[PDB]
């Protein structure tokens, strides 16, 4: 689906974020560098019910991919309330898990061992 | 009809120069660059200024 | 000739406000600043980030 699905921070409610300014919508990808979506949402009658849910730490499903909102900028100019939403791919949220243990010394590792060490006992389902 | 051209040439005197303030432009550019920098820092975990 | 005035008024209704994008301006400014920084670095040998 080409529209955006909005799931709240507490995952209690999941709906469709309508009346998105698709002209301002943009999807940026760069290998090993970035993966994000940015757009602007105006509060209208159609999305007034769920316009309060779209905020930081909310989840947006777009083309089958999940993006966590990392920057929300509500703005009020007269009668129009607009939020500038920037969301990064959920993979980068893996930075919330830290491996405190250290394998001291110089040693020849492979990618498999380092990856297993990095994502050991994850609580975020990675 | 002469005073029609009177007003037309009087208001042709208008300077075709619109001076735009540089300070606000610089501040907006700085804010957008800061947004980009924060995005890049987030993509690399925390291996940056913060 | 009344509809001349009607149409000209309807077209005067237009807002004389042209919004210009800020992200594009910021990116262009950043690219130009990068060009200047690279020039200065080259003129200083390699005593810079690269």
């Amino acid at each position: 689906m080409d529209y955006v699905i909005i799931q709240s921070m507490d995952k209690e409610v999941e709906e469709i974020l309508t009346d998105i300014d698709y002209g301002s919508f943009s999807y940026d990808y760069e290998k090993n560098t970035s993966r994000a979506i940015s757009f602007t949402v105006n509060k209208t009658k159609q999305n007034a019910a769920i316009f309060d849910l779209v905020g930081n730490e909310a989840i947006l499903t777009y083309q089958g991919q999940q993006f966590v909102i990392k920057k929300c900028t509500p703005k009020s100019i007269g009668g129009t309330i607009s939020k500038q939403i920037t969301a990064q791919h959920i993979c980068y949220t893996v930075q919330d898990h830290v491996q405190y243990n250290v394998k001291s010394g110089r040693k020849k590792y492979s990618i498999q061992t380092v990856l297993e060490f990095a994502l050991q006992d994850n609580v975020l389902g990675f | 009809l002469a005073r029609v051209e009177n007003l037309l040439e009087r208001l042709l005197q208008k300077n075709p120069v619109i001076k735009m303030d540089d300070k606000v432009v610089a501040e907006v550019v700085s804010r957008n660059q800061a947004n980009s920098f924060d995005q890049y820092n987030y993509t690399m975990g925390g291996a940056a200024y913060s | 000739l009344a509809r001349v005035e009607n149409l000209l008024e309807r077209l005067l209704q237009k807002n004389p406000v042209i919004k210009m994008d800020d992200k594009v301006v910021a990116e262009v400014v950043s690219r130009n600043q990068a060009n200047s920084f690279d020039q200065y670095n080259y003129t200083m040998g390699g005593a810079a980030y690269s």
Binding site: - | L11 | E5, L12, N15, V17, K19
Partner: peptide, 27 residues
């Protein structure tokens, strides 16, 4: 004829202001 004059005067007077909004601030 006079209406044409007044309309042109007001049109150029309004045109004088111009826009160039950054996001919401002027220039």
């Amino acid at each position: 004829a006079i209406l044409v004059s007044e309309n042109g005067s007001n049109f150029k007077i309004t045109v004088t202001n111009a826009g160039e909004l950054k996001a919401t601030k002027v220039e």
